[PDB]
Design an enzyme around this catalytic site. Structure first.
Site, short mmCIF file in Angstrom:
data_model
loop_
_atom_site.label_atom_id
_atom_site.label_comp_id
_atom_site.label_asym_id
_atom_site.label_seq_id
_atom_site.Cartn_x
_atom_site.Cartn_y
_atom_site.Cartn_z
N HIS A 165 -7.11 -6.00 1.04
CA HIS A 165 -6.03 -6.68 1.76
C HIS A 165 -4.69 -6.06 1.43
O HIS A 165 -4.48 -5.62 0.31
CB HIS A 165 -6.02 -8.17 1.41
CG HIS A 165 -5.83 -8.45 -0.04
ND1 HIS A 165 -4.58 -8.49 -0.63
CD2 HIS A 165 -6.72 -8.71 -1.02
CE1 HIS A 165 -4.71 -8.75 -1.91
NE2 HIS A 165 -6.00 -8.89 -2.18
N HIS A 224 -6.71 10.50 4.02
CA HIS A 224 -8.16 10.49 4.07
C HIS A 224 -8.67 9.69 2.89
O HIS A 224 -8.46 10.07 1.74
CB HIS A 224 -8.71 11.92 4.01
CG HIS A 224 -10.21 12.00 4.09
ND1 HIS A 224 -10.90 13.18 3.90
CD2 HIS A 224 -11.15 11.05 4.34
CE1 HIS A 224 -12.20 12.96 4.01
NE2 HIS A 224 -12.38 11.68 4.28
#
Lengths: 205, 205, 205
Positions: A135, A144
């Site tokens: 979150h 990446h």
């Protein structure tokens, strides 16, 4: 659009093309690639990357840039965007993406990846196989997150950084831009821009 | 076949039997085991492993060998194959397996596991809970990829090797045969046959 | 009950509220929180935690305690239970939980988490994003298994222990109560009560 052109027919490209095929929304999926001809994994390579500027119509093709290298992905994505091509966010059916996550164009979220509530991903992010972004994370452009890497809540990752396979972060850590964290790196503190780190805990190389 | 005999009623066996039950394709699922009698986790233990050579018909039972130990799994699987039994590839409904992956008989792919495009798994491989095998990997016979281990693209793993829980590999690494990589091992280079490694980075023990 | 009150509207709370929303079984999902007012992530904060003892009826509200801190989660959960509130086990649709697992009230199992056969989870456990608990594990009360942590078979984790993001255990390991294992910790032996460990292998801090 009815068609998708996947730029890059390497291993990452094969996975991205299968992801798109699984969505069942494109009439045709093709590759552009500069090193291979014919077909790859059952998808045709219709030409080199010169087709982007010269041939393909943005009214007919969506584009995704399946290049792992973050700098090159950035260069090609920005060129595609500048030529007016749509760069769909491609999310595998077996990924879980929170309805409160925000994800920028050209991003790819692989099978088993999770992006949790309140996370913000900028353009061209890869959340690779089974990687999780918990979150309230912020992943800047062309980041990446490699397979199986796990970011705790409130992790920030700067532009073009590569977080290696199986790496993880502690909550509330900030990784700068252009950072490389090796496979298995355990990020327990903030990492300054441009650094390469690895180990448990992750230390400069 | 209508029936499945799971050889080995230990913990791994319980998980494999539940995987098969989830497929909803067998009329009956039973155990063979040499140490326990009665029933295990609601599945009957119909006899010892002597039933394989002496009693079970290959026209009635499929076989899976739910033994974690790679050498023993090899021995039993090869014996079952020699007696003419089918050894189905068992893939959990919650695993994701690429349509371009090739997987040998007797292999098991657990819940949340992923096998990506172009990967080749030989006979009797275990891809355990939430383990991932990325694009273009080669896993030789009777390899065990333990829960939560993550292999990067183009990883090769030699015959009977065990990659521990939570381990990972960098791309283009080659692990030899009969190798043991401990839980959490971070494989950053090639590992010669027969070696035991652990740590971050993985080093010989 | 028709309504769910999620106690704690922080990041963990947002994820738990989305998990409940995904179940599609509650008529309304609300927060109690002591630090924020208005609404969070589209769910209303209807009051502070004083509503639990003073206002909410157990005939109308189910309770879940979305507090990461294990001691505080324990305190609030035990208070809710004492006031007669139901504390549903909340399992994300994208988690995989074995039909032979036993899970105590107030526990939460996040997206991509797996709990395998024969595992027993006591009250108020969190199995966080993509964490896995393999066969025959025992997780005592108010244990937190953080995102991407992987427990091998037959792992026991004592009461209120926190296993960090990306950590893992070898099979048959026992972690005592009140233990903290840092992100990425590789638990290769038994850990005595009250200890903090980290590293690969996990050692005392």
């Amino acid at each position: 659009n009815r068609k998708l052109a996947v730029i890059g027919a390497g291993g990452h490209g094969k996975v991205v093309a299968e992801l798109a095929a699984a969505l069942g929304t494109y009439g045709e999926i093709v590759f552009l690639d500069d090193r291979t001809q014919g077909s790859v994994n059952g998808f045709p390579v219709i030409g080199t990357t010169l087709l982007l500027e010269n041939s393909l119509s943005p009214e007919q093709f969506d584009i995704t840039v399946a290049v792992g290298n973050n700098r090159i992905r950035r260069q090609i994505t920005e060129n595609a965007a500048a030529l007016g091509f749509k760069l769909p966010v491609l999310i595998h059916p077996d990924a879980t993406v929170s309805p409160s996550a925000i994800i920028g164009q050209g991003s790819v979220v692989m099978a088993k990846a999770v992006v949790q509530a309140g996370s913000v991903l900028k353009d061209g992010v890869i959340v690779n196989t089974a990687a999780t972004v918990d979150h309230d994370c912020l992943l800047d452009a062309f980041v990446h997150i490699s397979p199986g890497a796990h970011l705790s809540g409130n992790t920030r990752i700067g532009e073009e950084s590569r977080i290696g396979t199986g790496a993880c972060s502690r909550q509330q850590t900030t990784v700068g831009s252009g950072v490389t964290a090796g496979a298995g790196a355990v990020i327990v503190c903030d990492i300054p821009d441009g650094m390469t780190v690895a180990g448990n805990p992750a230390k400069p190389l």
